[PDB]
Design an enzyme around this catalytic site. Structure first.
Site, PDB file in Angstrom:
ATOM      1  N   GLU A   1       0.818  -1.207   0.000  1.00 57.52           N
ATOM      2  CA  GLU A   1       0.000   0.000   0.000  1.00 57.52           C
ATOM      3  C   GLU A   1       0.853   1.260   0.000  1.00 57.52           C
ATOM      4  OE1 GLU A   1      -3.244  -0.073  -0.419  1.00 57.52           O
ATOM      5  OE2 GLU A   1      -3.705  -2.167   0.015  1.00 57.52           O
TER       6      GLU A   1
ATOM      7  N   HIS B   1     -15.699  -8.943  -7.914  1.00 58.21           N
ATOM      8  CA  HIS B   1     -15.408  -8.048  -9.034  1.00 58.21           C
ATOM      9  C   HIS B   1     -16.454  -8.141 -10.137  1.00 58.21           C
ATOM     10  CE1 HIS B   1     -11.575  -8.854  -6.965  1.00 58.21           C
ATOM     11  NE2 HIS B   1     -11.302  -7.595  -7.251  1.00 58.21           N
TER      12      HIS B   1
END
Ligand SMILES: *[C@@H]1O[C@H](CO)[C@@H](O)[C@H](O)[C@H]1NC(C)=O
Ligand SMILES: *[C@@H]1O[C@H](CO)[C@@H](O)[C@H](O)[C@H]1NC(C)=O
Ligand SMILES: *[C@@H]1O[C@H](CO)[C@@H](O)[C@H](O)[C@H]1NC(C)=O
Ligand SMILES: *[C@@H]1O[C@H](CO)[C@@H](O)[C@H](O)[C@H]1NC(C)=O
Ligand SMILES: *[C@@H]1O[C@H](CO)[C@@H](O)[C@H](O)[C@H]1NC(C)=O
Ligand SMILES: *[C@@H]1O[C@H](CO)[C@@H](O)[C@H](O)[C@H]1NC(C)=O
Ligand SMILES: *[C@@H]1O[C@H](CO)[C@@H](O)[C@H](O)[C@H]1NC(C)=O
Lengths: 201, 596
Positions: free
Chosen positions: B357, B487
């Site tokens: 991240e 998704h």
């Protein structure tokens, strides 16, 4: 001898509110004693870039008048307050001459000029037909004509209002945080120079 | 005066008025995510509606400037991004129906709760109730029950919704001068107007097949080894000649195989590289984890985190009183505000996730100099790939020894490298046929190659042909087995993971050649190398201003996605798997030979 009547630098630097960069305040400073070492030895300034003169001999030299221009810009726009620079602020808001003698002082003011909702009390000029001349102020609020069609005073298509507000939040990055900029302009004219530095005893 | 100057002034006005509004929307989303309260939901919805209405009005204003009279590439790119209709080209009734369908699929997926018939007094949600069962159980019929019951409830709810969804999205895409919705998704990789570096929407499918044909022997050997180990784990269910049963792959859908590492470990007797206990012994806070990640990024030469990052990020779970989303997310809120929202534990996974991240954050910081509408990755693959390369570099034993988290007298022999590479293959190689098969199936559904009455007969046929995974029992057309995944049910592109996986190892070879690493590729660490960081940052600073082919030329020296760095990365494991598969049979049969 014993020196009194210092120049009013408290009403420029420590002002409770600063002007917008499109309507930058100019204060003419005359007939007093200007102690520049108080400003130079302060730890509160992030930029103290002097052009055409060095800060150490400012407290010695004497000038006819001092022009103190004060405004607020972004962090990434401080570099444009310099001779020969290009950008929205230099072209359309505040233009410095190439042959400029004076100092550009800038400091972060995220503490004062940012509120949690967003401080939109600071506008800049985004569009003008031509670049500004040095030390010119444009406070016109006439609709910018980017296209061939006449604007007719209404902000429609290809016609934009030239003054746009700054969004100042305290959680913004350092390149978007508000910076208070004071530009001091030193000129010597054939009149007797009265803004002198302090003389040592 | 000219059209190009008019577009430039309009883009200046747009960037100016779309930066503060995007910051307000992103700040509202942040305040919802760190504080789940109903007024924060209302503030998020208000900011999102203002942002979407402003984008509709600016796209409507933007279309009045024709594209072919503008020659500057960046201005044309921003105008191309702004002039997309989106759903606005569709009628208002159908647009409202599409938005309603998307929202109700989001609620069905998020609030889908399934439990055993005749025991309905309490039920388990997907995360973490069903995830833990799929990832940790060793019982055949329990996993079969969980898998079939969740695809029964979720698919039978979502099948008419998906049948409406495909028709509405195809109508919107053909109204936008695309062939289908698959062409709309493939338009992210479309490069037009650059001499030599042009990339077509039709070239993407050909390149994906061409790379997967080279993936296929490594995946076949890995599949044979996993089949033999799962045959050892489950004695009678798995056939030597057939496909793998679907509910035994360690995840709900077969997305990753990383939960089979315990069952399929080569050398269990040898130790692991787990550094969790070492951080617990030295009392490493999550602040120390992120500071070590920052030390990694300053060692390679990238900029360090802002003061606003350390002040404004939430790197620890707040408590019982305050609710927050547990999923790790890097936020580019706008106006130089970069934050990480992660509920960080003291584990290796959270440490690697912190590196991943913060790689996302570095990528976001690098293109902050770009104009607002160009502040994205060059494609959808690069943005995830630049975090995954940090996850690659931080996981190496050299990085762990360098920062002191691993003992300096840890013996790095070939067996530990083999089992580490097998874990990385279960994470990385195993997702590639699933990703390729899912995207090819969705492309054939949108293209109309597969009629609605034949969706599942083809789908399992594709899964047997490509993934080598067989259904436990046959499913009719009342099931909707794809849309049980996050998704596909929430209108997200899925080829980004395939492209991310290949770009990951391409970037890794480029930076390791820059860092002058002289050993195997998986032993390579990009810390302490200023030139590797410079080669990375040259591409990172561009953002979406340049084509992704030109950015890939800037990093690896190639104009197209390449498969050879991935095969070079797993080459010790490939030779070891070829040695281990002498007695067994590589490849599978698409027939129903194990069970159906
Ligand atoms: C302005 O405020 C600062 C903050 O304390 C102070 O140190 C300084 O003396 C004041 N005056 C000037 C002229 O800077
Ligand atoms: C989270 O929301 C509650 C509810 O209004 C509020 O009292 C609290 O201050 C919020 N937390 C933070 C850190 O602001
Ligand atoms: C395109 O426009 C940008 C400003 O938005 C300018 O800096 C750049 O030089 C232009 N490129 C060309 C090739 O004119
Ligand atoms: C968006 O829709 C309008 C309405 O028909 C159309 O005129 C315009 O060409 C569309 N824009 C694009 C990029 O397809
Ligand atoms: C980032 O690096 C600069 C350069 O050394 C340093 O001055 C600054 O303090 C660093 N940032 C933080 C938050 O420590
Ligand atoms: C490791 O190397 C030794 C010596 O070359 C060899 O005997 C052994 O089989 C190797 N192990 C693996 C897993 O490659
Ligand atoms: C990277 O640099 C730091 C500081 O110079 C050093 O402690 C560390 O050992 C270096 N890493 C390697 C692998 O040499």
């Amino acid at each position: 001898p014993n020196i009194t009547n210092l120049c009013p630098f408290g009403e420029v630097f420590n002002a409770t509110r600063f002007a917008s960069v499109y309507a930058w305040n100019r204060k003419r400073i005359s007939n007093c004693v200007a102690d520049y070492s108080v400003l130079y030895n302060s730890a509160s300034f992030s930029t103290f870039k002097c052009y055409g003169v060095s800060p150490t001999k400012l407290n010695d030299l004497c000038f006819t008048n001092v022009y103190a221009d004060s405004f607020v810009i972004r962090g990434d726009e401080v570099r444009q307050i310099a001779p020969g620079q290009t950008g929205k602020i230099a072209d359309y808001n505040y233009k410095l001459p190439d042959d400029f003698t004076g100092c550009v002082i800038a400091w972060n003011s995220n503490n004062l000029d940012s509120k949690v909702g967003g401080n939109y009390n600071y506008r800049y000029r985004l569009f003008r037909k031509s670049n500004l001349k040095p030390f010119e102020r444009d406070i016109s609020t006439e609709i910018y004509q980017a296209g061939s069609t006449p604007c007719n005073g209404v902000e429609g298509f290809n016609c934009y209002f030239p003054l746009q507000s700054y969004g100042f939040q305290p959680t913004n990055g350092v390149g978007y945080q508000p910076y208070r900029v004071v530009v001091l302009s030193f000129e010597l004219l054939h009149a007797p120079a009265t803004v002198c530095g302090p003389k040592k005893s | 005066s000219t059209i190009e100057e008019q577009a430039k002034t309009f883009l200046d006005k747009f960037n100016h008025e779309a930066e503060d509004l995007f910051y307000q929307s992103s700040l509202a989303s942040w305040n919802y995510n760190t504080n789940i309260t109903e007024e924060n939901v209302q503030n998020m919805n208000n900011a999102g509606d203002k942002w979407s209405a402003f984008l509709k009005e600016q796209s409507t204003l933007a279309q009045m400037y024709p594209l072919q009279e503008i020659q500057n590439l960046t201005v044309k790119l921003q105008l191309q991004a702004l002039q997309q209709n989106g759903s606005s080209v569709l009628s208002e009734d159908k647009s409202k129906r599409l938005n309603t369908i998307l929202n109700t699929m989001s609620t069905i997926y998020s609030t889908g709760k399934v439990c055993n018939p005749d025991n309905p007094q309490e039920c388990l949600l997907l995360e973490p109730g069903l995830n833990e069962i799929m990832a940790n159980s060793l019982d055949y019929n329990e996993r079969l029950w969980a898998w079939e019951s969740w695809r029964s409830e979720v698919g039978k709810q979502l099948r008419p919704l998906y049948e409406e969804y495909v028709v509405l999205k195809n109508e919107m895409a053909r109204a936008n001068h695309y062939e289908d919705y698959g062409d709309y998704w493939r338009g992210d990789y479309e490069v037009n107007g650059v001499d030599g570096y042009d990339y077509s929407r039709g070239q993407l499918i050909e390149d994906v097949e061409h790379t997967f044909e080279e993936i296929k022997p490594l995946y076949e050997h890995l599949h044979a080894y996993v089949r033999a180990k799962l045959m050892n784990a489950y004695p009678s269910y798995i056939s030597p000649i057939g496909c793998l049963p679907a509910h035994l792959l360690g995840d709900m859908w077969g997305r990753f195989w990383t939960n089979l590492y315990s069952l399929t470990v080569p050398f269990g007797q040898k130790p692991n590289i787990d550094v969790t206990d070492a951080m617990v012994d030295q009392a490493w806070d999550a602040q120390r984890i992120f500071k070590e990640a920052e030390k990694f990024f300053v060692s390679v030469g990238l900029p360090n985190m802002t003061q606003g990052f350390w002040e404004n990020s939430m790197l620890t779970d707040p408590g019982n009183v305050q609710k927050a989303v547990c999923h790790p997310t890097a936020w580019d809120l706008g106006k130089g505000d970069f934050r990480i929202l992660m509920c960080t534990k003291v584990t290796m996974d959270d440490f690697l996730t912190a590196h991943h991240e913060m790689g996302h954050i570095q990528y976001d910081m690098a293109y902050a100099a770009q104009p607002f509408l160009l502040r994205n990755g060059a494609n959808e693959g690069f943005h995830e790939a630049v975090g995954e390369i940090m996850s690659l570099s931080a996981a190496t034993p050299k990085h762990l020894k360098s920062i002191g988290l691993l003992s300096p007298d840890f013996q790095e022999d070939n067996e530990t490298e083999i089992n580490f590479l097998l874990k990385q293959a279960l994470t990385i190689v195993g997702t590639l046929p699933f990703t390729y098969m899912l995207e090819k199936w969705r492309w054939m559904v949108f293209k109309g190659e597969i009629p609605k009455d034949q969706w599942m007969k083809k789908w399992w046929e594709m899964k047997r042909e490509i993934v080598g995974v067989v259904e436990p029992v046959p499913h009719d057309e009342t099931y909707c087995d794809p849309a049980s995944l996050f998704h596909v049910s929430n209108d997200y592109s899925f080829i980004r993971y395939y492209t991310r996986t290949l770009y990951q190892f391409q970037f890794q070879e480029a930076l390791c050649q820059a860092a002058k690493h002289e050993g195997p590729l998986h032993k390579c660490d990009i810390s302490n190398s200023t030139e590797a960081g410079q080669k990375l940052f040259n591409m990172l600073r561009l953002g979406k201003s340049e084509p992704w082919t030109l950015a890939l030329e800037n990093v690896v020296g190639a104009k197209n996605m390449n498969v050879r760095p991935l095969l070079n990365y797993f080459e010790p494991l490939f030779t070891w798997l070829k040695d281990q598969n002498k007695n067994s049979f590589v490849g599978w049969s698409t027939d129903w030979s194990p069970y159906a």
